[model samples]
Target: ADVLVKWSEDLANLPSIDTQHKRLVDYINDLYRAARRRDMDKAREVFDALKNYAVEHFGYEERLFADYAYPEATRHKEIHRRFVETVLKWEKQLAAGDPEVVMTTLRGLVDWLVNHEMKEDKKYEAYLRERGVS
Candidate 1:
């Protein structure tokens, strides 16, 4: 319950997608713990890993959207790309050695993930489910 993000039912997507999303949550917790321990090295490592995995996961979704020809693919991909750019900015700030940056980023990440999954991702659920993409 104390984790930065929890794998709640509302966040569930397709099995594969949910698995990846849960992994992201795990990384969130890892970052949280790193922050609590004041382990800057570990925090940097986890942050990089989280960002990298998120990019790859977005690719997975984009590929599926193309293969299945999701009508909203363009919009979704744009959101993914824009979000990546935003995080890259955060990555730079974090690298500048400000301890508070990680804390702020951790909160921002949780907010973004929850909102993104709840809103954007849910828009694709019925569309993908009907196509047997689950």
Candidate 2:
């Protein structure tokens, strides 16, 4: 319901990664708005966009892990995979047109973003930065 996560210096990673996160926050906020309005149609629109963008973002981030030889690449990818599964599960349920599940998924997304994405992302970025990756 509230803003999911804001773009912040504290949460900033590499510029590309940061930009991806900002876009995701925007999409998530759109979902919040749709949820608030109780419009499943609008929620559907936003959910599709969010999933598309999220998948692309995951791939890009995983590529970064490969290029940088990040120590936790496989583990990090598994985390990403789990997130995808979670979001997709709710997305399917959301498509069933439930008012309640919208917020449920949003909270889940927020939980993952705040707890995992922000923390693990920056560490990977900074790790590669030391090795001269941009």
Candidate 3:
């Protein structure tokens, strides 16, 4: 059975964001399983997917935020910045041959992403709807 991340119903109404969010969740789950199995190559592949997809998804949302002039845009950008820093730190630890650190970092990242989507991304969804973007 595949592990499922629990998403709030409130998040489902925003299809575009929700879709990307689900993909992110799946990637995280894949990373978790790969790391648990001590499959470094598989874990790295999933991490790469997560990193690339996150960049693409963030860019998409950033464009919408820019167009709508979302008041929290700076804060949102900070969240992205912090996430990138955390990921890079994990990458460095991985390069140093620390599987335990990589696993712990991946778990922390998954938790952070869940909280961030609930608190931060949802705000943009509300802003976009208020502006009649959908």
Models ranked on lDDT: 1, 2, 3
Query: Which candidate number would show the highest TM-score if scored against the true structure?
Result: 1
Q: Write the per-residue lDDT of candidate 2 for residues 1-134, one digit (tens) a residue.
A: 36656777777877778788888889988898888887999998999999999999999989978987889999999998998998789888997766899988988878877877687777687787787766
Per-residue C-alpha lDDT of model 3 across residues 22-94, encoded as one tens digit per residue:
8887888888788768788888888888888888888878888898899988889888878878887777677
TM-score of each: 0.94, 0.92, 0.88
Clashing residue pairs in candidate 2 are: none
Q: Point out the higher-scoring one by lDDT: 1 or 2.
A: 1
Candidate 1 Cα errors over 4 Å, as ranges? none
User: Measured by TM-score, how close is model 3 to the native structure?
Assistant: 0.88
User: Judged by lDDT, which candidate is best?
Assistant: 1
lDDT score for residue 131 of model 3: 79
Q: Every model's Cα RMSD, please?
A: 1.2, 1.6, 1.9
Model 2 reaches what TM-score against the true structure? Answer: 0.92
**lDDT against the true structure, each candidate:** 0.88, 0.85, 0.77
Query: For residue 78, what is the lDDT in candidate 2?
Result: 96
**Candidate 2 lDDT:** 0.85
- Candidate 3 achieves a global lDDT of 0.77
Clash totals, every prediction: 0, 0, 0
- Scored by lDDT, model 1 comes in at 0.88
